[PDB]
Amino acid sequence: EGDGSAPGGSVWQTTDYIALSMVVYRTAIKLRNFVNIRGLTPTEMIVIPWNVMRFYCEYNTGTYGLSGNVHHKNYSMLLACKAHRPTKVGYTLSNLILTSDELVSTGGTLGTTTTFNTSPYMIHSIDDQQCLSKVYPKTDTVWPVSSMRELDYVASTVSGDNAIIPSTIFNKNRYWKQGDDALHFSHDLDLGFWFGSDYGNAYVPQNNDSMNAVGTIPTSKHINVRGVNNRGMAGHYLSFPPIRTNDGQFKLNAQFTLETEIEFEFRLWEQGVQGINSVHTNLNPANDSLWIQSYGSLVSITESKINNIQFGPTCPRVDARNKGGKMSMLFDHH
Amino acid sequence: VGYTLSNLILTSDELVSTGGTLGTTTTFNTSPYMIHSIDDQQCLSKVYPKTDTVWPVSSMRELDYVASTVSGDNAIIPSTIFNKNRYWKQGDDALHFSHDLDLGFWFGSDYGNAYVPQNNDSMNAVGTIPTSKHINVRGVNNRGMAGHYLSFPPIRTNDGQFKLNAQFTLETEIEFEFRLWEQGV
Amino acid sequence: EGDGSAPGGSVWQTTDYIALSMVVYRTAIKLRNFVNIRGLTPTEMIVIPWNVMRFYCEYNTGTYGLSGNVHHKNYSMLLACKAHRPTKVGYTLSNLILTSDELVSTGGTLGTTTTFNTSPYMIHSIDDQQCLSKVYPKTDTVWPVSSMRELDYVASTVSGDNAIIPSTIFNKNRYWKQGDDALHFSHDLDLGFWFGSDYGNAYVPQNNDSMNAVGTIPTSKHINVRGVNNRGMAGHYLSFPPIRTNDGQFKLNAQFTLETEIEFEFRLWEQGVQGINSVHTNLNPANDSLWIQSYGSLVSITESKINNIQFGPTCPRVDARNKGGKMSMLFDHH
Amino acid sequence: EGDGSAPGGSVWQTTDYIALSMVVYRTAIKLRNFVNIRGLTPTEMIVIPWNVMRFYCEYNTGTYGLSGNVHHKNYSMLLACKAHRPTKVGYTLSNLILTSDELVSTGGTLGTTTTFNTSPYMIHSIDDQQCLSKVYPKTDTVWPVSSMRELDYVASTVSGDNAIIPSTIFNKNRYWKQGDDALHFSHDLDLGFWFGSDYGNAYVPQNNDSMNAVGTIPTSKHINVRGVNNRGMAGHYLSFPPIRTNDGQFKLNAQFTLETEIEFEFRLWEQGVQGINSVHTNLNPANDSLWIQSYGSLVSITESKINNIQFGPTCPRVDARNKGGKMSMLFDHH
Ligand SMILES: [Ca+2]
Ligand SMILES: [Ca+2]
Ligand SMILES: [Ca+2]
Numbered sequence A, C, D: 001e002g003d004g005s006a007p008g009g010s011v012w013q014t015t016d017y018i019a020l021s022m023v024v025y026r027t028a029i030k031l032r033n034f035v036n037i038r039g040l041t042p043t044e045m046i047v048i049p050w051n052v053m054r055f056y057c058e059y060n061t062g063t064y065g066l067s068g069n070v071h072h073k074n075y076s077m078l079l080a081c082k083a084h085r086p087t088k089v090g091y092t093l094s095n096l097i098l099t100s101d102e103l104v105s106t107g108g109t110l111g112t113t114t115t116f117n118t119s120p121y122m123i124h125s126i127d128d129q130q131c132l133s134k135v136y137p138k139t140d141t142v143w144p145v146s147s148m149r150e151l152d153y154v155a156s157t158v159s160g161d162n163a164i165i166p167s168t169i170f171n172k173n174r175y176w177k178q179g180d181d182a183l184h185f186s187h188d189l190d191l192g193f194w195f196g197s198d199y200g201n202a203y204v205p206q207n208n209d210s211m212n213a214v215g216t217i218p219t220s221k222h223i224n225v226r227g228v229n230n231r232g233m234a235g236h237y238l239s240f241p242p243i244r245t246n247d248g249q250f251k252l253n254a255q256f257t258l259e260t261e262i263e264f265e266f267r268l269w270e271q272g273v274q275g276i277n278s279v280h281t282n283l284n285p286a287n288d289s290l291w292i293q294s295y296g297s298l299v300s301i302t303e304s305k306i307n308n309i310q311f312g313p314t315c316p317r318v319d320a321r322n323k324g325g326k327m328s329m330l331f332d333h334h
Numbered sequence B: 001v002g003y004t005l006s007n008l009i010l011t012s013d014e015l016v017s018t019g020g021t022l023g024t025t026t027t028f029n030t031s032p033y034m035i036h037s038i039d040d041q042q043c044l045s046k047v048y049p050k051t052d053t054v055w056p057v058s059s060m061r062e063l064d065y066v067a068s069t070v071s072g073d074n075a076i077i078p079s080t081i082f083n084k085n086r087y088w089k090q091g092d093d094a095l096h097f098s099h100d101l102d103l104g105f106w107f108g109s110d111y112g113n114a115y116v117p118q119n120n121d122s123m124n125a126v127g128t129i130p131t132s133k134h135i136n137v138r139g140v141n142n143r144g145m146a147g148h149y150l151s152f153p154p155i156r157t158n159d160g161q162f163k164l165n166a167q168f169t170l171e172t173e174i175e176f177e178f179r180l181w182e183q184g185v
Helices: A018-022 A053-057 A073-080 A277-283 C018-022 C053-057 C073-078 C279-285 D016-022 D052-055 D073-077 D275-281
Strands: A024-037 A045-047 A083-085 A088-098 A119-129 A154-156 A172-177 A182-188 A220-226 A236-238 A252-267 A300-302 A303-310 A328-333 B001-012 B033-039 B084-089 B095-098 B147-151 B164-175 C024-037 C044-047 C084-086 C089-100 C123-125 C153-155 C172-177 C183-187 C220-227 C236-241 C254-266 C301-302 C305-310 C330-332 D024-039 D042-049 D082-085 D090-098 D119-126 D154-155 D172-177 D181-187 D221-228 D235-239 D251-267 D300-302 D305-310 D327-332
Touching: A018 C024, A024 A053, A024 A073, A024 C018, A053 A088, A053 A252, A073 A252, A073 C279, A119 A252, A277 C073, A277 D251, B001 B033, B001 B084, B001 D275, B033 B164, C024 C053, C024 C073, C053 C089, C053 C254, C073 C254, C089 C123, C089 C172, C123 C254, D024 D052, D024 D073, D052 D090, D052 D181, D052 D251, D073 D251, D090 D119, D090 D172, D119 D251
Parallel strands: none
Antiparallel strands: A024 A252, A045 A154, A045 A236, A083 A252, A088 A182, A088 A252, A119 A172, A119 A236, A220 A328, A300 A303, B001 B095, B001 B164, B033 B084, B033 B147, C024 C254, C044 C153, C044 C236, C084 C254, C089 C183, C089 C254, C123 C172, C123 C236, C220 C330, C301 C305, D024 D251, D042 D154, D042 D235, D082 D251, D090 D181, D090 D251, D119 D172, D119 D235, D221 D327, D300 D305
């Protein structure tokens, strides 16, 4: 009888500190942008940097990326809590506006204007078969990270002597016209672990031939969280259909709104004296390293400029038993 | 109180040049749109005219009032910060906006360039300073109106930005209750 | 038909940024402590600093309070999110151990030991009628804030010529013996508003004769959140029954465990470009001041030492229509 | 098992001192009077001082008001208990007797006598629309407070050049004849608070344009009981219909009995040592000021004589949501 505080019977025991340390809180970062794609020939193609973490949670448009600390403030506090995990990520292309430079000439006096009819389209390509494993900027151009969210990144897909029309090689190609419904693209992440640091121009976690989701080198004589199972994202791209003119190719320009959303889960500090700031340094659990794992693989950045983008999708020809849910396993290292 | 935007007509100055001989005309296709923004989160608390321009009150109902929303070094695209953004094209149904006022009191004077009554961080609905040693009607509860705005999507051209011009009809309606004088002598 | 993106019909409109800014996340800070109450005569009384915010979320025991930044780490991040609110607050006294100095003498050779039988008790007093509005330390002693959670704060309640036995004036007096069940005390806060700053040795919000829950001076020609309705906390106290001896009073010493819990709600940053760090300074809503309100009333602290503690409970003789749930109202100031 | 006094289990706790401090005791003061209204022309009008507290609980008639301490003894002890509240208040006019001076002349030999037939009447006017906000005595006369309960107070309601017949402007006008049933008038007070002092020629509590129910100036940095909602009393009046004669106006004189009743609630002292006379001075709760509030607004008295009477009724054109029950709210002051 009683709560146990009596001399005999059951032991009075203190309240549970786990329950509040395991509660998963779930937030998101939503951002809108206007994208203007101009002067894109049918060979060259816009690379959607949609597999890089910085695309969703940091707003790089125009002058913003030049100014400092453009991260969304929900993300700045995800570094205040002890663990965060990116979970689902996605974006939306909406309200396409095509314009034409066909009336434009060096003499001027006539500017670009929307296409005379709505038959033209912009091709949204998803490369499932990974025709392009690794994508580089065009010879003259370069990819700024400050420019990331307005989609200027132009790749020229070229065989040895052959200029590749991107829509022809890629698997899913959506021909998206003026008036069509918005194009919604999403990726679900199921991670068995959490991140304690900032992404820092890392790809949003993927398990692929190109990259793995967990970023820490596992170390000897204990168990470490290890990536497994091949979850990855398909290399999205934007291109225009080749249309021949009296001279060269038809000039198609596109506008659309870019709505990106990344949904973070985060988790808070240990209850009790363990969570006191002064004593948490040396009372921090050493098994954080077990479930808290940093970021796996970084985009290649020299200066502020992206060197290349790797995609590596969950390829359909991997055994379906490998392609399943959980992206990490807790496995030892000798 | 409320208003309606209806029968949008977009035109383009793209064919217009200083040499002339070609005037503006309706957009070649109906894909362009005018963005109607309602700021729910109050990104903009207080709005000022552009540096060169000014806002006449005599001009109020034809909507010329132009604000330039700018961060420190950053020019803000209005549609990106605001909460509800309607992209309203040619042929779309009219846009109806309304605000219901529930006041516990009445007004005896003219509004006289007053905001239609609101309870907010910026303003309160009742205008008289209450005075000592008795009971006075006091604003309460935060009823306010969202900062509606109109803007066009950025569209790059060979030079600068695409020139979008808009026409629409503005139907406003304000519904007054009124009350008459005391009976008797 | 469609999502609205077509030329005619309904307006395609962007995603809602409110839903994620209104989501209320709910955490707590739990801390345990051992309290040793010694040399407390029947006139003097231990003041439970249970109505001060710093009691629950900052751990002041022994050497900890001398060391820097002893706040719990869940609270340090409540300053990272834009709004937090304290909601429920409470504490538990458990596993009482009484000891006696009766065998102790200046000659020594015999130390204190647990009471020969379990008949003695420690009195837990809740002052409902507010016999003591404002409580001061004893003439010689002083109340450190670094000492807060181990309960050393001793008040001597005295009439003009009369030494008050605390248990006699106070309303609820629990005589709590060795083996009795733990004593659980809780206070629910219903606030209509949120806090954007640190409590900073503020009383956990109360509406009373002594103090109000909202801390900002309201300013002219607009509406401001105003405290209302008298929610307050009863002045908890600890004392021992007077027991006469051959010389003076029986020496009762007490041990018990102090488990405090404070449950915070918090709320995150605005979605969209409004929530970008660089532009959030000047795009911060000016109506934050409407629902975000700081801390109302501070304990009186000179140096590190508490000058006095005010209690001000929700008194039972206030009309029950005043005593109800919501602690704030949004009311204008002229 | 047991009452808790055992070593283990539940805490034996002392009896509740709230229950007896919250018990509301309810009394009343009833007084009868004979009113003689003579020489009242149709322009001038009797002001019923029925909204002043002293009307009901202090008996001012003839020589009584000249003698000292004419308060009813139930009221003298309402100052012995710690709190009292006026609640309902009302009065009755009964058994009207009209007489005529028409047969009276300066030569005499014929005195006044009851009207030849019962057709004449005395007009009881209730001003709902507040035609008269503030009422003054006639130029020559003055209003003694010692004369209050026999109704001599004569106002002359006059426009700029126009003598107002009172019955014409006022809303409810009862033409009350000889033999008509008694006229009963009542006002219910719902206060959220109590009074600790004497009324002291205060209006019985009202919330109006002219006056408020709570009399203490609220003070900084805590919560204070504040009047709210517009409960007030209509300016009752007595007048006679204009009846022209061969010379001037018909002389109507009235008698009736005035039965007034005021129903007080009162509340007693704190139980326990807190309620001991010697220690109650410094153990008095400081939150009395929260629910104990004095008197709001005073009639204007120079010497013993009333300067003016303010009425301020619950006007019907205030929103019905404002006009509801509770006359006070517990609201903070910064
Ligand atoms: Ca046990
Ligand atoms: Ca449409
Ligand atoms: Ca027991």
